[PDB]
Symmetry: C5
Subunit: 269 residues, 5 copies
Amino acid sequence: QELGNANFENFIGATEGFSEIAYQFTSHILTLGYAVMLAGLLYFILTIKNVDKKFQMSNILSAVVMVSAFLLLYAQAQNWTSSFTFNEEVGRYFLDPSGDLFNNGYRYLNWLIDVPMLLFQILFVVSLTTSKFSSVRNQFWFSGAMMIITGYIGQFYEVSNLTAFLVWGAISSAFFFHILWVMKKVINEGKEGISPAGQKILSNIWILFLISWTLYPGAYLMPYLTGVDGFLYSEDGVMARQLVYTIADVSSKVIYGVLLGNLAITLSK
Amino acid sequence: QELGNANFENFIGATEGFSEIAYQFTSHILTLGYAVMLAGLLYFILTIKNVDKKFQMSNILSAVVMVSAFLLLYAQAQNWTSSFTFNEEVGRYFLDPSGDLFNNGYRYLNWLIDVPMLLFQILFVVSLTTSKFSSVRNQFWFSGAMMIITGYIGQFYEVSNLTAFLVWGAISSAFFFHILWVMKKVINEGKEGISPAGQKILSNIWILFLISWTLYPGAYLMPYLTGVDGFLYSEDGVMARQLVYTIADVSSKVIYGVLLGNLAITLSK
Amino acid sequence: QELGNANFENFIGATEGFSEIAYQFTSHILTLGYAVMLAGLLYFILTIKNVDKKFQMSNILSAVVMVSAFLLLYAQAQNWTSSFTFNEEVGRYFLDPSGDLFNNGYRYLNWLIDVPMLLFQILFVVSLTTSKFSSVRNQFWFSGAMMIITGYIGQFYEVSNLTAFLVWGAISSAFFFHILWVMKKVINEGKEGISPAGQKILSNIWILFLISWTLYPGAYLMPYLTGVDGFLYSEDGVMARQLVYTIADVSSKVIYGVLLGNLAITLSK
Amino acid sequence: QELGNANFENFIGATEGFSEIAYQFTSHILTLGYAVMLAGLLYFILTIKNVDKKFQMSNILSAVVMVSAFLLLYAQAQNWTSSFTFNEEVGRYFLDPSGDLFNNGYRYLNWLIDVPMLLFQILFVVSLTTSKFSSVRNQFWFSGAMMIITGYIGQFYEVSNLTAFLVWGAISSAFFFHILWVMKKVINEGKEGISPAGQKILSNIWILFLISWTLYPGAYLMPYLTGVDGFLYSEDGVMARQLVYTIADVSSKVIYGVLLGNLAITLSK
Amino acid sequence: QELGNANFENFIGATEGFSEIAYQFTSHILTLGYAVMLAGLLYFILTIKNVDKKFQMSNILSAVVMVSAFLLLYAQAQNWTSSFTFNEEVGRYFLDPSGDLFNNGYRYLNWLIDVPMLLFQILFVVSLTTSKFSSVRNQFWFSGAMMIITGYIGQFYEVSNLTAFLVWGAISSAFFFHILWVMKKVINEGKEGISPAGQKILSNIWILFLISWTLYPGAYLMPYLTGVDGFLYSEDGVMARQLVYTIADVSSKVIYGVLLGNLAITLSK
Ligand SMILES: *C/C=C(C)/C=C/C=C(C)/C=C/C1=C(C)CCCC1(C)C
Ligand SMILES: *C/C=C(C)/C=C/C=C(C)/C=C/C1=C(C)CCCC1(C)C
Ligand SMILES: *C/C=C(C)/C=C/C=C(C)/C=C/C1=C(C)CCCC1(C)C
Ligand SMILES: *C/C=C(C)/C=C/C=C(C)/C=C/C1=C(C)CCCC1(C)C
Ligand SMILES: *C/C=C(C)/C=C/C=C(C)/C=C/C1=C(C)CCCC1(C)C
Ligand SMILES: CCCCCCCCCCCCCCCCCCCC
Ligand SMILES: CCCCCCCCCCCCCCCCCCCC
Ligand SMILES: CCCCCCCCCCCCCCCCCCCC
Ligand code: NA
Ligand code: NA
Ligand code: NA
Ligand code: NA
Ligand code: NA
Ligand code: NA
Ligand code: NA
Ligand code: NA
Ligand code: NA
Ligand code: NA
């Protein structure tokens, strides 16, 4: 069967197929995904009047990220259940082409608009010292865009052309390190001037950001983390990838937003 | 027909099939389920300004539980009507594999995020005495997560492997008793310092929590409560399970939230 | 073909079929149904600040009834259009089993949660004299629940077993008369102490309640009001039943809520 | 093929079929329809605090009309795209009976709840002189209901029985002239006492009301405005009818509501 | 295969078909489209109280544009995924007529209502000097309507009749230049009287307006920008057109609205 430049999920579903657990779990973890985002949207809106007017822009941007996140992640959950149908004879879910091939593209475009907002909102809670607001913002937005775009191109060849997949992934990584660098500066300059309590939170925010954001490139390689024809190049790798994405999404957006809200309250008078 | 690690609902629907009453009732009870959650969401939002600012976090967390509860339970209602199609010849609903196998997973992931919030919101209304806030919270969140996760794994083998089903159920029960223990402490310490009216409510909250939360493990075993090839291992057991879940969900979330709101008002000045 | 314990709508659609008018009208009247409930929801929310804080609980409960009413009635409207497909040869809509059998169950569960709220909200506008608040509430909630449950069971046998259908209907009627009795007391005690204007409204509320609530049992018997093989035991009876339900729903919930709001304004200072 | 008492759209789609333009345009104009209503809903809600409390009831009723309008007009849109499928051989859209026959009913019952509200809201902005509020209201509500009901019956025979179609249309027209009469009185009495600016607006409101409301009966006859086997008794007549309805709906509800809001501001202090 | 007066997307999908990348990308860019509009809607509503009451009409009109923009663009996204189904044998997406032919009409009607509001909202932030408010408004609204309508007619013949396609496109362009002319005047008169900061923003708004609005006519010709049987008259041209539309939509509505909000704040006291 000819699939072309398709995600590895389609190859597993078209050959081996998915077990009740593998299929159901992937459905539940994606469903929990968009559910958390709508729950977060309601939280950030109902807690806007809990911080000084100057910090409220942080809750608004968190809400903006939640909305778009809910829609894209919701569409993704529907794309999964639509691309795989149960086979009575063997008792496994196989690729149903009539429902379109499954693609992690809806999530990559969710990042495109999110990344910029997530990096931008912290600049409304913390105060830079030697770095210019506009300068930091422009760096985040540029590197952020190039990181997502390059990665979006590579994920299409994660099976059809392993070379292109890694080359683009590498280029993407370049911009990722630059973002980590700028964010590190923002955290340091942010700690200067605030109470020890605020510093404690910024320290936790940096750890959360570092770990949660690293999970994404991990999910990108998931199918090859145990080498070609490895343990992860199966339905196990599919479950792992979608699970990691969900954990990363909740941590990088919802939890990240809650911590910023807590810091905003700490600095509020 | 090969189903594998699927819920017992699929086995009844694939062999005996469901009667108009059995199928329709299950559809109505699941529909009423998500309907109540959206009605509750509107109630908790419209009554936020009825309690002092310090207690408002309780209404917000109730609203958060309602939202996710509406989405997951809605999907669960669709997972039912889609998995069973009517057969004109015999006049019963049989497993329609094209609509995917029915799984009580969506409800298990709803708990995962709910359990933590439900246990945490009471800590914004009552005041601990001989227990540390962070300590109690960490215990609830840990045991709560382990309880749901372990149970989620077991429910997949409720037919394929009765042994694994019970072992996991038992492990889950362990964490459940620990939660009941901590909650009992919270209630007692909560009663100390408040008016007799507030104590009266906390007493009712403890009874509600004890009964409603016990229903879940009951629904877990529902198909075997009358032993293998028993009265409950039929469409009657399916109706019973989904009914008990719905009663438990409404009691543990909506009614539990209303009582907390009433207590918040009682302590409001 | 054996339909079993199914509503009479399915028997008409499976034998005679439905004409363009019969089918279209039923679709339009059910569509208008959920449309009115969402319109009402918006009205009760936008008019909350039009009455004293003590009466606002009435608008909130009206809103709660609207929400659930919209969801259940929206589903009921889908249960119709899905259960009947057009036959080109004869030019009539016949039972399409793939879309499930049509059941007035979604509406019965909508009452289960509504009835309690509708009877309870009037206790926030009027002031009892010799009757205890808790006492009246408990009677409404108990008789209300037993009335709906018993009726829900009977409607399943409206064709399969005419005897069971009437027996349950009769038992249900018992609790209905008890509710009418308690409501009559509440109205009388409510009139005592308020202005002639307020009394005028309570008089209208009693008439509305009496007529609108009586329509339900009428819709229950609709198919046999002209005896077996009568004029109403046709597509005409189907249209009549769904029409009566819609009229009853709009009157008992929306109009009832508007009058309570007008009374609240009359008593507001 | 037997269609029976069906709208003429079905006859054109079942015989000649629809061209890409005819089908696409009808879809676009109906889509724009419900889109405008949801846009209007947001406008009337966000501008409520722009007028004195006494006039705010006008914005609320406009919002009520928008909601219902959005739901019914959305359904009407779906009814279209579902009833006609593309034929590859000939390259035209033909009647797809599996999607139900297309009916302009959803739009008629929409007028049933709208008409009364649209005629009633103007009574909260203008002040009657010699006419009684209750009197005018009762006339609008009665004639309004009889006008819609009679018309709703006739539209079912616009093809099957041209005689019944015209008779009902005529009866409907009777109540329409009575409404125009009462509205004319309301406008005149409304002009007395208000500023020249307010009078200027009421003059515009009367012209808008006169033209927009006249379009409906025009859309009713659309298929026979060029006589039987005429230019309009084709896909051209279908486009014309749905276009006229959309123009009428936007003018009679959205624009009408905006003008009433502007008048409210003019009289606001 | 006979398509008639259909968009070129259908001809590519009916002959060559679409690759996984071409199809998936178009789906992602359209999905991101409606997602951004709902995110913008939430932003404009949550920031209304950030500007003086006199400028708030700008946020309201932005919100109005977002709503209708979300619904239409959502409908446009669905029109895509439904019109093209995957072929297992060749591994490409081909025209699925059962899902209707794809038409960029839903986007042309979104402009019809947007264009007027987008041109009108700037008149609530800036102050004209020698130009009359009513005069400018009437010109925008007239030329705006004629521009969209004429273009909407031409796009139907972008393949069937290249002559009609260009003629209408040309006529449309005429009204486009007139709009650019009037907008230029508004910007100039707007700069007079405001601070250098406000002027800086209006300068950016003019550049954004000029570029973003020019993209639309570019997307209109996209398939012929490399001449007939050119590089762009392929799936590459389809991706390019939908991408350009998405960039134009986000820039002309969301970004344009954000800049107006920033200017409103700059002039706010
Ligand atoms: C809420 C969305 C977030 C935080 C998205 C983050 C995305 C990344 C950090 C992506 C990084 C990637 C690489 C560094 C290489 C491989 C491709 C990417 C895009 C997954
Ligand atoms: C609103 C959701 C709630 C209250 C969820 C509660 C879940 C439980 C109490 C689950 C308990 C279980 C056991 C003790 C053993 C069997 C497996 C479980 C998870 C059902
Ligand atoms: C908004 C929902 C309302 C007011 C529901 C009311 C329901 C009843 C009054 C039901 C009564 C019935 C009987 C008295 C006998 C037959 C069965 C019932 C449940 C229809
Ligand atoms: C927003 C809805 C409105 C303004 C509806 C108005 C409806 C009419 C004016 C209907 C009039 C009719 C006739 C005068 C004769 C033919 C049948 C009708 C109902 C279309
Ligand atoms: C948010 C919607 C906007 C800004 C829409 C703008 C539309 C145009 C500028 C359209 C212009 C066109 C021409 C100048 C010629 C070809 C046809 C059009 C309509 C695409
Ligand atoms: C303060 C709260 C106390 C409320 C008391 C009564 C209200 C609860 C109503 C629920 C009762 C329903 C029980 C159903 C009985 C089983 C029916 C079987 C068919 C005969
Ligand atoms: C002010 C509250 C009282 C309102 C009474 C005024 C009239 C409004 C209700 C009109 C009801 C119309 C129902 C039509 C009757 C049946 C139609 C027969 C079809 C020819
Ligand atoms: C005071 C403002 C007056 C204008 C507002 C009303 C807007 C409606 C404009 C009427 C034009 C509709 C005609 C549509 C033509 C369709 C072809 C009809 C064939 C008989
Ligand atoms: Na997003
Ligand atoms: Na599936
Ligand atoms: Na939940
Ligand atoms: Na089904
Ligand atoms: Na309800
Ligand atoms: Na149907
Ligand atoms: Na309406
Ligand atoms: Na179609
Ligand atoms: Na729009
Ligand atoms: Na597709």
